[PDB]
Design a protein around this motif. Structure first.
Motif, PDB file in Angstrom:
ATOM      1  N   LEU A   1       0.820  -1.220   0.000  1.00 22.36           N
ATOM      2  CA  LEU A   1       0.000   0.000   0.000  1.00 22.36           C
ATOM      3  C   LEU A   1       0.859   1.278   0.000  1.00 22.36           C
ATOM      4  O   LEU A   1       0.533   2.233  -0.709  1.00 22.36           O
ATOM      5  N   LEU A   2       1.987   1.297   0.720  1.00 17.05           N
ATOM      6  CA  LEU A   2       2.892   2.448   0.765  1.00 17.05           C
ATOM      7  C   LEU A   2       3.609   2.683  -0.571  1.00 17.05           C
ATOM      8  O   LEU A   2       3.784   3.841  -0.939  1.00 17.05           O
TER       9      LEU A   2
ATOM     10  N   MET B   1       3.225   6.383  -2.000  1.00 17.55           N
ATOM     11  CA  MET B   1       4.389   7.119  -2.511  1.00 17.55           C
ATOM     12  C   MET B   1       4.268   7.480  -3.999  1.00 17.55           C
ATOM     13  O   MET B   1       4.783   8.521  -4.404  1.00 17.55           O
ATOM     14  N   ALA B   2       3.526   6.707  -4.803  1.00 22.20           N
ATOM     15  CA  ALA B   2       3.186   7.100  -6.172  1.00 22.20           C
ATOM     16  C   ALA B   2       2.225   8.306  -6.212  1.00 22.20           C
ATOM     17  O   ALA B   2       2.553   9.296  -6.863  1.00 22.20           O
ATOM     18  N   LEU B   3       1.199   8.339  -5.350  1.00 31.09           N
ATOM     19  CA  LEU B   3       0.337   9.520  -5.161  1.00 31.09           C
ATOM     20  C   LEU B   3       1.112  10.737  -4.625  1.00 31.09           C
ATOM     21  O   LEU B   3       0.889  11.856  -5.078  1.00 31.09           O
ATOM     22  N   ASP B   4       2.112  10.529  -3.769  1.00 32.23           N
ATOM     23  CA  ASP B   4       2.962  11.606  -3.235  1.00 32.23           C
ATOM     24  C   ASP B   4       3.924  12.179  -4.294  1.00 32.23           C
ATOM     25  O   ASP B   4       4.132  13.395  -4.365  1.00 32.23           O
ATOM     26  N   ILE B   5       4.366  11.345  -5.240  1.00 31.39           N
ATOM     27  CA  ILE B   5       5.079  11.769  -6.455  1.00 31.39           C
ATOM     28  C   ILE B   5       4.136  12.477  -7.445  1.00 31.39           C
ATOM     29  O   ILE B   5       4.530  13.486  -8.038  1.00 31.39           O
ATOM     30  N   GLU B   6       2.876  12.052  -7.555  1.00 28.50           N
ATOM     31  CA  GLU B   6       1.845  12.759  -8.326  1.00 28.50           C
ATOM     32  C   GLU B   6       1.486  14.120  -7.709  1.00 28.50           C
ATOM     33  O   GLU B   6       1.454  15.099  -8.447  1.00 28.50           O
ATOM     34  N   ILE B   7       1.515  14.273  -6.381  1.00 29.55           N
ATOM     35  CA  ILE B   7       1.376  15.567  -5.684  1.00 29.55           C
ATOM     36  C   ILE B   7       2.609  16.464  -5.910  1.00 29.55           C
ATOM     37  O   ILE B   7       2.472  17.625  -6.313  1.00 29.55           O
ATOM     38  N   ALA B   8       3.821  15.904  -5.837  1.00 31.55           N
ATOM     39  CA  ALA B   8       5.065  16.615  -6.159  1.00 31.55           C
ATOM     40  C   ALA B   8       5.159  17.047  -7.642  1.00 31.55           C
ATOM     41  O   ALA B   8       5.850  18.026  -7.968  1.00 31.55           O
ATOM     42  N   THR B   9       4.434  16.343  -8.519  1.00 33.62           N
ATOM     43  CA  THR B   9       4.259  16.635  -9.950  1.00 33.62           C
ATOM     44  C   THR B   9       3.130  17.636 -10.207  1.00 33.62           C
ATOM     45  O   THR B   9       3.351  18.604 -10.929  1.00 33.62           O
ATOM     46  N   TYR B  10       2.017  17.552  -9.474  1.00 32.24           N
ATOM     47  CA  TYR B  10       0.901  18.501  -9.506  1.00 32.24           C
ATOM     48  C   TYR B  10       1.331  19.906  -9.084  1.00 32.24           C
ATOM     49  O   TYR B  10       1.087  20.853  -9.827  1.00 32.24           O
ATOM     50  N   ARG B  11       2.245  19.994  -8.108  1.00 29.00           N
ATOM     51  CA  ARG B  11       3.002  21.216  -7.799  1.00 29.00           C
ATOM     52  C   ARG B  11       3.684  21.800  -9.039  1.00 29.00           C
ATOM     53  O   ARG B  11       3.517  22.983  -9.304  1.00 29.00           O
TER      54      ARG B  11
END
Lengths: 32, 51
Positions: free
Chosen positions: A3-4, A8-18
């Motif tokens: 699950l992590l 961490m893929a969603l957290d990279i998508e948030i770092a990319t959405y930035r």
């Protein structure tokens, strides 16, 4: 941990959405 | 906003040399050479000086 890998893929998508927000408001903010 | 590159010009303040006041001094030396009272020459030297 498996699950992590997806979290961490969603957290990279948030770092990319930035960088997408950074890029799109920069297309709106403009030269002489 | 690095403007003043325009600057809607500067087609300019134009203290240019397009002057004739600067006067057109028409020094007309009308040299009437008479013999006996008859005109023989009129050497009208127009010095057409732009000051």
């Amino acid at each position: 941990q498996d699950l992590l890998n997806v979290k961490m893929a969603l957290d990279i998508e948030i770092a990319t959405y930035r960088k997408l927000l950074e890029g799109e408001e920069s297309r709106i903010s403009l030269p002489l | 906003p690095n403007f003043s590159s325009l600057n809607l010009r500067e087609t300019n303040l134009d203290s240019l040399p397009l002057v004739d006041t600067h006067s057109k001094r028409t020094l007309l030396i009308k040299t009437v050479e008479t013999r006996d009272g008859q005109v023989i020459n009129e050497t009208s030297q127009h010095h057409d000086d732009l000051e």
